[PDB]
Amino acid sequence: ANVAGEICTADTLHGHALLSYWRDDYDLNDSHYYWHMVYRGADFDRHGEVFLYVHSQMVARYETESLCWSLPLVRPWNQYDDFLENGYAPISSLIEHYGGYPPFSTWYSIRNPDMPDTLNVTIPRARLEEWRDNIYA
Amino acid sequence: RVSSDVRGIFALPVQKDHKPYNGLSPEHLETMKAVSLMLDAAGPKLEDGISKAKELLEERINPELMRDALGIYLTHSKDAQQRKIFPPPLKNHPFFSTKANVAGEICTADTLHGHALLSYWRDDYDLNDSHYYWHMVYRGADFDRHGEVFLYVHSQMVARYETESLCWSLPLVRPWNQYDDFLENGYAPISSLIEHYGGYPPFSTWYSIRNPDMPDTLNVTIPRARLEEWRDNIYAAIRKGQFETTSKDKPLVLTRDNCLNFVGGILDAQYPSLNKLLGGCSLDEERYGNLHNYGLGKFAEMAYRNGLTISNFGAPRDPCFWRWYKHLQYYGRLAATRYPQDITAHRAEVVLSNLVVRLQDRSSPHYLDGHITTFLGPPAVNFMESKAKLGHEPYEWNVQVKSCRRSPPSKENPQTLTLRLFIAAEDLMNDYHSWIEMDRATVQLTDESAITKVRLDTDSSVARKMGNYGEPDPRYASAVFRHGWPQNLMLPVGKVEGMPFVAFCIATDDGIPDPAPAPPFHHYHDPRGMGYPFNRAWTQLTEDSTGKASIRTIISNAELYPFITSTTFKIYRTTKF
Amino acid sequence: RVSSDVRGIFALPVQKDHKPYNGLSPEHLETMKAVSLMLDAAGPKLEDGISKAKELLEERINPELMRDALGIYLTHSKDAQQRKIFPPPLKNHPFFSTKANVAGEICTADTLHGHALLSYWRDDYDLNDSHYYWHMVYRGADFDRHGEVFLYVHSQMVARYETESLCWSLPLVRPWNQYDDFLENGYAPISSLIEHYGGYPPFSTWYSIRNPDMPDTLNVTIPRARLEEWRDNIYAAIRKGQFETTSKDKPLVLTRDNCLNFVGGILDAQYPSLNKLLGGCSLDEERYGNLHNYGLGKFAEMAYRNGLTISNFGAPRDPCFWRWYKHLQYYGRLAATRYPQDITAHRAEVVLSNLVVRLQDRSSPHYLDGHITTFLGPPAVNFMESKAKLGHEPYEWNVQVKSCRRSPPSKENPQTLTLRLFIAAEDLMNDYHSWIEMDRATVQLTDESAITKVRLDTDSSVARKMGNYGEPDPRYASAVFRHGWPQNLMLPVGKVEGMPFVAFCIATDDGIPDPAPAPPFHHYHDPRGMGYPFNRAWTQLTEDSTGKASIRTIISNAELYPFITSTTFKIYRTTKF
């Protein structure tokens, strides 16, 4: 019935919260949404090239947008035992359907105990790191 | 069909043929009021007023003018009151509608300066709906104390606003004491409202003489210097202790008892009411003028840009009005220290102890007395709110009362006293005017033994008896107090770590109460003056010769003032997504 | 050995047997002044005063008292002036020494609130040394315009402080207009100074009556209410246009000409000087009191903690005094709008055009007229500075002047006029009192043709003629203007992106100058009143009936006011490590 807006408060305005206008942009989100429908179809040779380029190109824009407000550059998720120190909450209208995570959330080392095996195959952090190490090598 | 006539009228849009209206112009308010009386003059029943209204409307009277007139009319109609027919929710106002997409607020590094963070509090729907009804209540013509109420309500919302400011560690408000001042932050109504009226840029000011681009049909020229003169004269009168009358040597002499009513009354140009006390004499309206309402008019004039109807709408939303409200509060400070009062003069023969402010739910395993909780949830954007919707977990206060009366109270001869509860941010505690009223409650004793009186938040004499967004409360079908303080704003927001406040409770003997004024003025009836005992300076402090005495020492002195008690508590801020 | 006697005296430490002294108490200042006169009474030569001084010192008179007395004495001794013997640099003051390690400032997230960033400006050594000498200059007893100078200097430093505030986007100052106000940020002297005196916590206030823990030997009880009454009476008098005399019906009538001198004079309790103009009558000192100096006394009293000698030291460093200075400025605003002045009344018969503010070095390949530069370098911690040392690249201004006089000027009959230069932050431009004086310069014409007058920054009539830290300037061995405005602070700091300001230049005919007052009062001699033409309201605006007129419109109207011109320029902020 009521339209819930965003909680813009001194408590919620940390990290890259100001960039919310850019990340929540409807047309970015609708574009991204269709992109995956486009991408996930099976002539076209260069899936990997496109994958890397599109993602690198949106990072360059996101980071540049960050600099405009004099905010820090993004810390890449290069170390998989890293913390997400700011935590995240979807805009209030979306909180009904899914949630965020608190400050200093991390990957689960092995698995989420409270997440049923029917949703989620156990892939421990170490297993992903090994793949990463091998692609590096 | 009476109720849908009323909604139909309040929905009427201002069109381009309508004579322009300025709901913040004293001249236009005079006209509006006569039209309101016109409605009253059409007969004893509602359908009479509404017939006159329809008639005037199709004669093309301005609908905004009509909304103000009809609002007052309904509020003070005995027929409407008994038929429980009310002016509509603020939500029905034309400005709460477009002309497809719901525009939210621009929260940006560029727009987050000054007191922008407090937008959640100033845009609060229920504060705004309460304020909106308050003016309908106030603008009706038994009720004696318009000036006292005017000053108290405005001073009390300033104390709360300023305290709310301190919670976020923002600066205190600069009062609009100097009329050549700048508004350095500028203001933009929340995007949904920008359609119907605008704000003003950074470093806007009053116009020295007038807005050149504002038609004379909206706005009588009142130069800044003219307002300053009125101010200077009210200043001078308060210090001298008299307001000059039209007749040379019969000044109205200010007294401890009448100072706030008169100072407040004159600020709001209530010369007809105040004059009825001067035994055939008239207050000099040329000397003291109409400072409050012409003052508001200057902010309207400042904001008017390149006539178009101006609605008295959304004043609490705008930071410039809080600077004016704190200026109003200044007159209260002047009068209050000029006419001190004995803090013992109306003591109840009772000993107070053990004052506590607590959560109602005491189940938490970390629970303590004196640790209570607020939360910031999502604003309701369709109800014109921004940044957050404040609320608090249910609280209660209690206090221990034991009689002290020479004859033991009995079921045959009860002791009746009144408990008055105030809180203050610990830093502001020694300023009388920083004390926030939280409750006023009658206690009746029939024994020698100590009782514990308990009061819920939702029973507070100060509170508006509605849920969020004007949802009704079953328990309070009779006395809704629509123009009271919103329950969700009763507590200052506090700090995440828990902000220290002080609770103060005084027990007074108020004698036998005279009958409360008729609706809708029955909420502001107090033998002691609104905001007692913080509404005048205390003689125990003004006459202190040691220099040691403060509000803090007195309210910590259980020995010498047993009918007063105080206790510290903390308010903790929370976010609920 | 005269010079080393003086340094020896100024170095003398207050010891525990010395009778306590309060350099901010009016009672103690009276004593200090008599002691200063005592020094003067010992003879016509310096060695006379210094002999008396030594004598009094070994009689154990308080050394801080002596420093103030000796300072005034030296400043106004004709012997000392001609012998170029001066009161010592502020750097020699005992507080500029320990009792091993040099303590810097605590710059922390906890300590960076309010206006803490402006510390570089308030702690500036040369501002502080200038202010320190100014009081020695001012406190000497021909010179007529103490009150005018008092108000102007304080209003002019407030305009600069507030403008400096805007450059960092900080709030404007809340004036100390309400005496029951809080100081919500609290203050701590830079760590090197904390040894000799302390600050005060957040939300400190005046004491209502007195500091209980402050001995009566330092501090006469002046309750807050007593100061408010004085304030109220000065307010009332300004509006009424008279100050009451001791004799019932001979009030001193305020005039356009005398208002600031009298308002300023009374604020500073200069009843002996002001009374010499009332033809056998006396101003009512009971009604108007000594508000400025007792006011300063209340901040000293507020800051005094658990007697010990109190030095009048470092007032500009403390944010509470800027709130008092802006309160002083308020009296100036009241008087100024009450007695407007004709902006054409003293026009020079001249046409001004082409006003420019520029760098002196125009070699840069991105160079433009109207783009000038400030820098923030390291503070000199040993000179009690913090956060930065402001400075600016060398600038100049120039303007085009062409005669308009009926007889063409000639070498036989020159036209002499005075050019008056002011700047203002573009946002504050329509406030008279926000205009900052930058220069005043005589021009002599001998032809019909246009000249371009050029003025360097370092020749400014407003500026202190010293390098940083009181280093002398060869070119200005005679007129050092030690108590003038520091050259390094002449420009508001500006913004990195270049902050917009407006330059204003008026040409006046000042007639034939009367002889300038004797040293050390020769810097404040102006036929028009200090800060002209921004020192009173303009009649062109107070009498405007259109509502269109502002300072901005007038100073942009080359047609109607050809003897005024204005131009925009930008100040760019820089850091030099």
Swiss-Prot record, chain A:
Cyclopenase; part of the gene cluster that mediates the biosynthesis of the aspoquinolone mycotoxins. Within the pathway, the cyclopenase asqI catalyzes the conversion of 4'-methoxycyclopenin into 4'-methoxyviridicatin. Cyclopenin can also be converted into viridicatin by asqI. The first step of the pathway is catalyzed by the nonribosomal peptide synthetase asqK that condenses anthranilic acid and O-methyl-L-tyrosine to produce 4'-methoxycyclopeptin. 4'-methoxycyclopeptin is then converted to 4'-methoxydehydrocyclopeptin by the ketoglutarate-dependent dioxygenase asqJ. Zn(2+) binds at H32, H36, H55. Disulfide bonds: none annotated. The chain holds residues 137 to 282 of 732 of the full protein. Changing R40A: Impairs the catalytic activity. The lineage of its organism: Eukaryota, Fungi, Dikarya, Ascomycota, Pezizomycotina. This is Cyclopenase asqI. It comes from the Eukaryota. Belongs to the tyrosinase family. Changing H55A: Impairs the catalytic activity.
